[PDB]
Design a protein around this ligand. Sequence first.
Ligand code: ATP
Ligand code: CA
Lengths: 146, 566
Amino acid sequence: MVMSLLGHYNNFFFAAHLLDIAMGVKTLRTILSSVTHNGKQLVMTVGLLAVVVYLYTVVAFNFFRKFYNKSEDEDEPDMKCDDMMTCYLFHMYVGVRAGGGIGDEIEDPAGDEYELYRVVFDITFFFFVIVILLAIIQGLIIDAFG
Amino acid sequence: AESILEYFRPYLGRIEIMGASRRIERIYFEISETNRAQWEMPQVKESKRQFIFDVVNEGGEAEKMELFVSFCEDTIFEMQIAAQISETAREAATALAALLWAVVARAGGELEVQRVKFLNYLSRNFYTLRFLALFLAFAINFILLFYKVSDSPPNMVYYFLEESTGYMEPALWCLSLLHTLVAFLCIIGYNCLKVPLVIFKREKELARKLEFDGLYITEQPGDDDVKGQWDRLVLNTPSFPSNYWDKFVKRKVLDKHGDIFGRERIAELLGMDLASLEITAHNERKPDPPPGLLTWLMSIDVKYQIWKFGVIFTDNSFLYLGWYMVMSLLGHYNNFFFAAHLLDIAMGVKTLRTILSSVTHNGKQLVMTVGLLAVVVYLYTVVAFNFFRKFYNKSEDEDEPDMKCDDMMTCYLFHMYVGVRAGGGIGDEIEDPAGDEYELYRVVFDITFFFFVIVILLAIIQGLIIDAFGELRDQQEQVKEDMETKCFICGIGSDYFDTTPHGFETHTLEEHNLANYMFFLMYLINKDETEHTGQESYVWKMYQERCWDFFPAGDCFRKQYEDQLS
Ligand SMILES: Nc1ncnc2c1ncn2[C@@H]1O[C@H](COP(=O)(O)OP(=O)(O)OP(=O)(O)O)[C@@H](O)[C@H]1O
Ligand SMILES: [Ca+2]
């Protein structure tokens, strides 16, 4: 009722009705219920992913400052390593997505210093929050529907 | 007589044993109310849960009852030990952090006496100290989330830039000072509370091994286990049974094997030399030596102290707490070392401990699979090292100082670091094979590389870790459910008891209940041997002789008397 009434506010609020109804045929209601059926462990797993990404953020904050830049010529006003908050946001928003961890969006480690101290960082980041953690999260929701 | 029966319902306790008649018999006794009151303690219930999960899951049906009786013997110990208790980004960050914390809390000479008075307070409330430690770690990390680095001091300076509010800067200092103390309190509480359990367990196990076996006198020590060797340094001490009840157990071993072997050798191996003095001590009377308080108390068994310290340090929980200590201490090195605490604690809620254990649960094949992936990538590296040199370059104009094909080491590193990741094998990061030469000799290389180390090998590795977690969940579910379809004492399930309504509740609540035996074992202790009934002494004799035939194991008063009582 209230959304239908607010629809006459000259807006698209009518676009929020289809949903509620679309979920009338069970085979979709079960899907919608699967999200919260097993959420008590889903929230813990999400928290674990968040703390692992934060751990990597603080590891790379005071060791790999000179890599996190967006490669702008003659000036680098954008550095995602100076503040802890911006670095954490950048990791949590870019590294999780992408194919492969934060090895596709930062400078090449071809430089002599810390090369072997960052190749392992990239590999373990790709191995611990992409091929296991996201796999587990996707598995939990899909398996509950089954 | 309904009223008296109802009043006396929570005291009478039924058990069922068989023996000397080859038929099931009933027993009755009185359950003291203090024991029932102390039964529902926070530690006791979780210990029972852990014990039942361990017994049902780790395989049984042969030593099950022996482990049951052993658990009873151990749990009596802390039932005793319980006696000593008498008296913008910031807007988003706060909202998200509060949600995470909320769900975690939803599932998380005469002057020396005052020292003991204050120290006994820690053992009473021990879990809350750990709760406070987790809370402090959370708060200090959330404060840490506001750091910044500048090229000049306010040579890089890690100056902490707070918000417009000038507060919360010294709060970091005070919280850092407070966290170390509230973790040291946890350490002291653990050293005061839990270590008697493990010490007593080891003492009891050694006493059982010596009494009913000659592993340290007759045949040989196993000489292959650190636990089975480090204990050789305590046999000579005069105070070996420090916490076990049998404080004169040394007599039994020499009385059982001191004749078949060298009696002097036996009486010298176990310390306690000159057994004539021990024999003649109980001849005239019991003298009372004068007290030597605070004068000769320094003289203590050095060997026993060393052995106890070894048993302490070989443990895992205490080592974990000490690791927490050392990291907290190193935190005051003006660093982020406080960021390594959240973890250890975060893994407190099981549903995460199972995930953490799944990584190493099946690692014995995981390492082999990783090695196989490494050798396959190396094989492709040596295949492409002497055939496809002119492709591996980073496309720099007018000069190519960077070639990842010249050295074998650089080529292998480049493959192992780039090709595995990426979507598709090494076909997205090197030159196009459109050139006429070797085109069909490299298209197949790219395709097979994408097919053999990406869509199979990584899939297998991801499958192994994920599936193990599923197996762990299934194991926990099965250990929860199996106990709901059997009795853990009877050798039969719920199907036969379900022929009548509430049959299983009747077979589990008033008949053998897994808790009536708990009261029975310590009720036998209180009543002197002269007052034992015609059956109490019967079971007590076997219990002292370690024969578990008196458990029913197959039928409980109903299969025997089906026709007479249906
Ligand atoms: N032989 C048995 N002894 C005890 N409980 C049994 C037995 N067989 C089945 N059960 C089931 O186990 C329940 C008690 O054991 P459980 O491990 O669940 O105890 P708990 O976790 O302390 O809590 P609660 O007693 O409320 O279930 C009984 O209520 C019954 O449903
Ligand atoms: Ca008598």
